[PDB]
Amino acid sequence: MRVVVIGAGVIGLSTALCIHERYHSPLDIKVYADHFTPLTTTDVAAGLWQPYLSDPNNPQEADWSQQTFDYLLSHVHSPNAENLGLFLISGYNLFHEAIPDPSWKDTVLGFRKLTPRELDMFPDYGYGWFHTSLILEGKNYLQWLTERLTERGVKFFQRKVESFEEVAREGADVIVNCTGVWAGALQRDPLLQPGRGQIMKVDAPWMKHFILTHDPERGIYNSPYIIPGTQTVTLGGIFQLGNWSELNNIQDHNTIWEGCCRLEPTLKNARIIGERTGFRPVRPQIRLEREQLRTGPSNTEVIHNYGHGGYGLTIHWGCALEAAKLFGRILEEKK
Amino acid sequence: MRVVVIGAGVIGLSTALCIHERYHSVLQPLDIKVYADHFTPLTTTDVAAGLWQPYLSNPQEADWSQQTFDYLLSHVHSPNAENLGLFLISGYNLFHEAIPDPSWKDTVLGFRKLTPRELDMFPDYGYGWFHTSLILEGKNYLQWLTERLTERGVKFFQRKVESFEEVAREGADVIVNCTGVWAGALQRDPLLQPGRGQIMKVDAPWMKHFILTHDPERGIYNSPYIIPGTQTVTLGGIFQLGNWSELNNIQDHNTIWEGCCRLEPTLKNARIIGERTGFRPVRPQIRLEREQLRTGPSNTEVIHNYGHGGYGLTIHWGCALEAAKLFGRILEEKK
Numbered sequence A: 001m002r003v004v005v006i007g008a009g010v011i012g013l014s015t016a017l018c019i020h021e022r023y024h025s026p027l028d029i030k031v032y033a034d035h036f037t038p039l040t041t042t043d044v045a046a047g048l049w050q051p052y053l054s055d056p057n058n059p060q061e062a063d064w065s066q067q068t069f070d071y072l073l074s075h076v077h078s079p080n081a082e083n084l085g086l087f088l089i090s091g092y093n094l095f096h097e098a099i100p101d102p103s104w105k106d107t108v109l110g111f112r113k114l115t116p117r118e119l120d121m122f123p124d125y126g127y128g129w130f131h132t133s134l135i136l137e138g139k140n141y142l143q144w145l146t147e148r149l150t151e152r153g154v155k156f157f158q159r160k161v162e163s164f165e166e167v168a169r170e171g172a173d174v175i176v177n178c179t180g181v182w183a184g185a186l187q188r189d190p191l192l193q194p195g196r197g198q199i200m201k202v203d204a205p206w207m208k209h210f211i212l213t214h215d216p217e218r219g220i221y222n223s224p225y226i227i228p229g230t231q232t233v234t235l236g237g238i239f240q241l242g243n244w245s246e247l248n249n250i251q252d253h254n255t256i257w258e259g260c261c262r263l264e265p266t267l268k269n270a271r272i273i274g275e276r277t278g279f280r281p282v283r284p285q286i287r288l289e290r291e292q293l294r295t296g297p298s299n300t301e302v303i304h305n306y307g308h309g310g311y312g313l314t315i316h317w318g319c320a321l322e323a324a325k326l327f328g329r330i331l332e333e334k335k
Numbered sequence B: 001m002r003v004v005v006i007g008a009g010v011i012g013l014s015t016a017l018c019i020h021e022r023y024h025s026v027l028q029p030l031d032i033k034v035y036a037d038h039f040t041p042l043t044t045t046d047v048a049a050g051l052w053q054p055y056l057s058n059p060q061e062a063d064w065s066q067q068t069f070d071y072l073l074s075h076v077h078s079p080n081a082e083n084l085g086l087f088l089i090s091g092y093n094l095f096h097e098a099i100p101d102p103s104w105k106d107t108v109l110g111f112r113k114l115t116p117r118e119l120d121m122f123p124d125y126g127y128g129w130f131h132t133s134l135i136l137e138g139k140n141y142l143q144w145l146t147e148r149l150t151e152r153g154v155k156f157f158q159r160k161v162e163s164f165e166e167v168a169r170e171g172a173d174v175i176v177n178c179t180g181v182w183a184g185a186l187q188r189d190p191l192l193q194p195g196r197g198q199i200m201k202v203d204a205p206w207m208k209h210f211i212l213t214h215d216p217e218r219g220i221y222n223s224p225y226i227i228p229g230t231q232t233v234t235l236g237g238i239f240q241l242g243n244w245s246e247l248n249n250i251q252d253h254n255t256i257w258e259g260c261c262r263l264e265p266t267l268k269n270a271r272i273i274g275e276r277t278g279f280r281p282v283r284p285q286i287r288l289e290r291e292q293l294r295t296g297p298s299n300t301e302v303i304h305n306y307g308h309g310g311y312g313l314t315i316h317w318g319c320a321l322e323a324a325k326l327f328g329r330i331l332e333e334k335k
């Protein structure tokens, strides 16, 4: 059974790992990707576990997000959780209005509304939440997934796939399409578009909480947020639909710094370390489904797993579990 | 009006500040001087991680603690918060059995019980709390107070005071005794005793919460605790009555490290940065009262402000205000 996983981001590596630990013994797993850690969108993410506020169009995604939290919760107190870049963090979600509770309110730990004395610390906001969640930094998690894969016999190849057929010609029986925001290059998807994001990494070691603000009229993550990592603090708040510019933007740089300093004036004493741009694979819902390749002399099974938007880290494991369930359905039908 | 404050820890400097801001105008001149054998970072105040949390049990002590928190909380987003060494932090208080709520439950931010899913992360404990408090790092706060004092004309002097009388003979009208655990060298106090504590400073920046454990089998502050500072994380849990050893010892280092690693297994990847020993000024209650000096030819009143145990940072401001009131009493009896 010969399988090719395209994509070395959090989605491709976790799917390759998750499929391997369920369906090996003898599985031939190969990972094709043209960029690896540190040069993926997964490495640009702060890694805060938090799905979108509104309910997902696919209610299964709330299940996938809950399965990812429980899986990461089973790692947090293991002695090597820092090798995963995983740790607990509590923080604030700030609003100008009483947004309804999110679907993940019982998934995170200790979800509650903010008290007036807490809201008095943020004069520009009149409502919000407090809860405890997790951070999973891509740079560490992708490296962890890699050696978990390599020590299992999984081989990696740096190469740009031009088409599913080219891989099908080489004899792949299953193609796992985990190409993120670039899935349209292999199969047109007018529902897939980039959510361009720019972030800033600063040295602010006194920041122990995440702080996320929301103006839903401006769009999700078009409002300042502050997310402490393991080494530095991530400043952000830019979500640009349809923008493919990978270069850092000067107005976006000012927008991040302005907004975050207004939110947390202590950041005026912070040292800027770096600045990065990434593309969220935006889709009305995640494409997680099986598909027959209707092109070429062979019918090759494709498991799609892309379009995770701004919550790929948040949801990757449940999606990997679902893709593994589809792989098994293929393995049974092929007999 | 000559005043000599003995001690440059949090009690002496805050008392000297409170006395000046309250009686500077009505007394021209008000000559305040601070005598101290040692200054930050060589005071007991500098060994403390600086977490605000009073004892778990004199009912004025609850008020002085709450006054301190409200005064510190009003500075959280101020431009000087980094100069003060102040920042917010949430964390866990863990118990082996159910315990009633503390008196200060409404002073901190978002106090609540731990949920079953949270308590599952700490198998050694079946009950606990979660809330948001403050850390005031003495290494910064003592420098901040010193600067506020010097700009108000308060002069500092490095000297070991041998007796109250030596300072009285030099013309001091009021002596504020803020000598902490060493107050007994100036006047025998069989109620004051050293509470020796050894701590560990480690580089574990993924730790965003404090964790305090409570073990009646081991004693108060003799159970592991984890308190993240700005640059390092304090590992502690040592309370030894009557031990005057100022050196770190290996057995106490092991007790802390093993205890904290059992509580938080990720610490096995932390770099130990440093290790300090301090002596809590243990007393059944704070000595905060006036006394006429019955030694030497001079008419000098002593204001005692010592014996704050393991909560001096937590309570320092309320005590400083009360000491300023006692100073006002002395002024009223001089007329």
Ligand SMILES: Cc1cc2nc3c(=O)[nH]c(=O)nc-3n(C[C@H](O)[C@H](O)[C@H](O)COP(=O)(O)OP(=O)(O)OC[C@H]3O[C@@H](n4cnc5c(N)ncnc54)[C@H](O)[C@@H]3O)c2cc1C
Pocket: A006, A007, A008, A009, A010, A011, A012, A032, A033, A034, A035, A036, A040, A041, A042, A043, A044, A045, A046, A047, A048, A049, A050, A159, A160, A161, A162, A178, A179, A180, A181, A182, A183, A185, A186, A195, A196, A197, A198, A199, A236, A277, A278, A279, A280, A281, A305, A306, A307, A308, A309, A310, A311, A312, A313, A314, A315
């Ligand atoms: C600024 C920003 C902040 C974010 N913060 C968070 C956060 O806090 N929490 C969260 O959960 N999510 C967050 N996200 C979202 C998260 O980054 C993504 O949802 C997630 O990384 C998507 O993973 P992926 O593997 O599908 O995409 P990618 O990580 O981009 O992986 C795509 C992979 O496919 C490969 N590939 C693509 N096309 C081809 C081809 N033709 N041939 C070969 N290889 C190919 C690429 O080389 C790459 O290895 C953030 C995103 C941005 C932009």
Ligand SMILES: Cc1cc2nc3c(=O)[nH]c(=O)nc-3n(C[C@H](O)[C@H](O)[C@H](O)COP(=O)(O)OP(=O)(O)OC[C@H]3O[C@@H](n4cnc5c(N)ncnc54)[C@H](O)[C@@H]3O)c2cc1C
Pocket: B006, B007, B008, B009, B010, B011, B012, B035, B036, B037, B038, B039, B043, B044, B045, B046, B047, B048, B049, B050, B051, B052, B053, B159, B160, B161, B162, B178, B179, B180, B181, B182, B183, B185, B186, B195, B196, B197, B198, B199, B236, B278, B279, B280, B281, B305, B306, B307, B308, B309, B310, B311, B312, B313, B314, B315
């Ligand atoms: C390990 C540890 C952890 C702690 N953690 C916390 C915590 O998280 N939160 C909290 O609120 N509290 C904490 N504490 C308690 C806190 O450190 C003390 O209660 C507080 O620092 C006492 O303040 P002080 O100014 O009286 O003593 P000090 O800070 O020791 O100041 C005494 C001063 O008097 C001077 N002095 C003494 N004798 C003389 C003399 N004869 N002549 C001249 N100068 C003299 C000294 O040189 C020094 O300047 C902790 C204590 C320890 C040991």
Ligand code: NA
Pocket: B119, B120, B121, B122, B123, B124, B125, B126, B127
């Ligand atoms: Na438990």
